[PDB]
Structure 1
Amino acid sequence: QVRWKIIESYNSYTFIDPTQLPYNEKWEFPRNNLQFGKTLGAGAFGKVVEATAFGLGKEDAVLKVAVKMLKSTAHADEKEALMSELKIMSHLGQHENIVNLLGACTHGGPVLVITEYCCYGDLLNFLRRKAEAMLRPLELRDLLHFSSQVAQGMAFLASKNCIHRDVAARNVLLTNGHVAKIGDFGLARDIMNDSNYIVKGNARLPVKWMAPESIFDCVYTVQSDVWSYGILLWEIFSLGLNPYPGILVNSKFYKLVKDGYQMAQPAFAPKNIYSIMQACWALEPTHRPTFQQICSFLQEQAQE
C-alpha cells in the first residue's frame, strides 16, 4: 500500500486504531460554503480539487483549500478508504509540516475531506524548474530547510506510530513561505499513469524509493520510511533527478539493491548530507537512524 497507517508498538503506544472507530462530527463543514475550482490531481478512485471555503474554523476565514472526494469508479471499499484517511487525520492532530485536516462534509451528499491547500505545488517539479531556470536561485539553506521540514513531519508521524509508505519528492508539497508539508496523497495522486509506480501483480509500487525489506518481504515500518527519506534527500540534493539515473527497474535492479548498491553523492550535497543518505540506506533496518536523530543532525548542518 501507499497510504498512511497506524501500527502497534511495544516510546509511543497505540491505544486505539482510529480507522476502526466512528468519525468525529466536530469536523463537519457545510458543503454549500465551498466553491469549487480546478482539479489538482486524481487517482483511480479519488480526486483533489481546489476550492474557496467560506467561514471555515475558529477565525471564520475565507480561504483556498484542497478538497478530496471520490470519482464515479468508487464503490464501498473506496468510500471506506477515504473515511479511514479522514479518521487518521482527525486522530493525529496538527503539525506545521503536515497537510492539516480542516473539515469534512460527510452528510447531504458525497463525502468531502477538506485539507490545507499548498500554493507552490510539489517539491519535485519545484526543484526541476529552479534547476533549469535561464536567469531567486536556490541556496544550500533552502535545501537544508526542505530536508529539515520533511524530517520534522516524519518525526511527528513516527511519534504517533504512523507509517507513511510513499516518501518521495513528488509527495512533498510547498506552501506559503515555500514551507514543506507531507500528507497522505495515495487516493488522489495519479499512480496509474506514472511509470515510477511499477506493476507488481495487482499493485503499483514506487520501487526506486522502497527499502529492500518492503519490496521483497512487504514489511513496512518507521525504518522503511527512513530508507525512502534517504532517497528523497538524494532527489533534493540532485535538484530533482530520477533515482538510480538511467537504470531500469528489472531483475538486475533488485539484485543491485539487495547486494548493497547505493547511488553516488548528488552534485549539491555536502559530504555530511550524503552521510545521512548512506545511514538511511543501511541494509539492516535497526542500523538506520531515527527521524529524531536526522532532525538533530540536520539542525547542526544548518547552524554550522
Structure 2
Amino acid sequence: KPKYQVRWKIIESYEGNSYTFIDPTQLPYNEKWEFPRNNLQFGKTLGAGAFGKVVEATAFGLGKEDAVLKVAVKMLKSTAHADEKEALMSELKIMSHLGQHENIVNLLGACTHGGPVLVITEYCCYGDLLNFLRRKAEADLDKEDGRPLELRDLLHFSSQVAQGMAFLASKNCIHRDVAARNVLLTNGHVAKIGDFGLARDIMNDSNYIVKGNARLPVKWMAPESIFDCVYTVQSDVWSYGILLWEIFSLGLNPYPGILVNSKFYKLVKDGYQMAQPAFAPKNIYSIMQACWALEPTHRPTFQQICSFLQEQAQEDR
C-alpha cells in the first residue's frame, strides 16, 4: 500500500543451498507477556510515523507488584490496514522467540485484550544513535553542552551493537535494517539494536528507495541483496560497516550527495567504497573495508569485530 512491517527474519534451514524462513504468522503468542492496559500511564510521544506511533509510558506492576518502570510502547493507528495488525503481532512473536540480550531492545510485555494491540519494549532515554551523534556534532551550546565526544565513546557504541548483532546471528536471525536510526541508547549511553521504523515516516525518507517490489534502505545494503535478493548474516555485516561509517562520521548520511542510480548499484557491486570518515582511525576504517568485501564469506563476524573494538577501547596501564 504500502503497509507497516518489520523485516527481521529467522532461518529454519539451511539445506539448499537455500534458506527457508520461519513464518511468524504460525508462531504462537505466549500469554505470559499479557499486561493490563490500565496499569500503563501514557506520556510523551517518542516518535510518530505514517502507520502508528511509539509512546513512552510508565508501567506499574510489571514483573513485580510494586515495580515502577519507564517503558516504550508501540501501537498502530486507529485506521490500521487489517494486518499490519498481524505484522505488529508477528512482531512481538519473532521477539518472544529470540529471548533477551543486553544490546538488543527487549520485549517487556503486550496488551492484547481490552483494545488495540500494544507492544511494550525497553525504554531508551537518549533516543536513537543518529540524532544523538548529530546533536553532539552540531555547533551550538544552547542545544547541547556536555562532555566532548571521544574515540572511546564511538568504540563503545560500535562494540555494543556488534555484540547485539552477534547474539542475533547466533539465533539464526537476520535484521535486514542495521542502521544508526535503528540503534537506541539507554542508561549510560549503552547501545541497543532494535527497529524504530514505526516512529519514522517511511514514505518521505530519502533513505528508502523504490527497488521494484518494496521500499528498501539501498545505501545500507550489500550488492547480493540488491542483486539478487539474498539476505544473510554476512549481509547484515555489510550494513554494519555502513553503520560504522555513520558513527565515525558523526551522523553524516552514507554516500553523501551520491545520485542513487544504476549504476550506483553496479559500481558498488564492482567494488566502489566510501572514503575514510573524518573521525575514524585507520584501523577502524579497515574494519569498514572488510565489511564491504564483495565476497560475503570474506567479511568479518560480529563477534570478531566486537572483541577487536573492546580491545581497542581498553585504557592502558
Bigger drift between 11-20 and 40-49 goes to 11-20
CA displacement 1:81-101 (0-9 Å, x = unmatched): 111110111111111111111
Alignment match, 1:60: 66
Alignment match, 1:31: 37
Q: Is the 8 A contact 2:11 2:21 kept in 1?
A: no
Q: Is the 8 A contact 2:25 2:86 kept in 1?
A: no
Aligned partners of 2:210 and 2:85: how far apart in 1?
24
Structure 1 residues 273 and 19 mapped into 2: Cα distance closer, same or farther (>3 Å)?
farther
Alignment match, 1:280: 291
Q: Is the 8 A contact 2:34 2:109 kept in 1?
A: yes
Q: Is the 8 A contact 1:18 1:91 kept in 2?
A: no
Structure 1 residues 16 and 129 mapped into 2: Cα distance closer, same or farther (>3 Å)?
closer
CA displacement 1:34-56 (0-9 Å, x = unmatched): 12222222343232111111221
Q: Which runs of 5+ in 2 are unaligned?
A: 142-146
Name the Cα RMSD after superposition: 2.4
Q: Is the 8 A contact 2:104 2:194 kept in 1?
A: yes
SS at match of 1:295: helix
Q: Is the 8 A contact 1:3 1:185 kept in 2?
A: no
TM-score (norm 1): 0.93
Bigger drift between 40-49 and 265-274 goes to 40-49
Structure 1 residues 205 and 12 mapped into 2: Cα distance closer, same or farther (>3 Å)?
closer
Q: Is the 8 A contact 1:209 1:231 kept in 2?
A: yes
SS at match of 2:185: strand
Q: Is the 8 A contact 1:280 1:289 kept in 2?
A: yes
Paired residue total: 304
Structure 1 residues 57 and 13 mapped into 2: Cα distance closer, same or farther (>3 Å)?
farther
Distance apart, 1:303 and its partner CA? 2.6
SS at match of 1:277: helix
Distance apart, 1:230 and its partner CA? 0.2
SS at match of 1:260: coil
Q: Is the 8 A contact 2:46 2:55 kept in 1?
A: yes
Distance apart, 1:20 and its partner CA? 1.8
CA displacement 1:274-302 (0-9 Å, x = unmatched): 11101100011111111111112212222
Bigger drift between 192-201 and 41-50 goes to 41-50
Q: Is the 8 A contact 1:82 1:187 kept in 2?
A: no
Q: Which runs of 5+ in 1 are unaligned?
A: none
Structure 1 residues 111 and 169 mapped into 2: Cα distance closer, same or farther (>3 Å)?
same
SS at match of 2:266: helix
Aligned partners of 1:103 and 1:84: how far apart in 2?
14
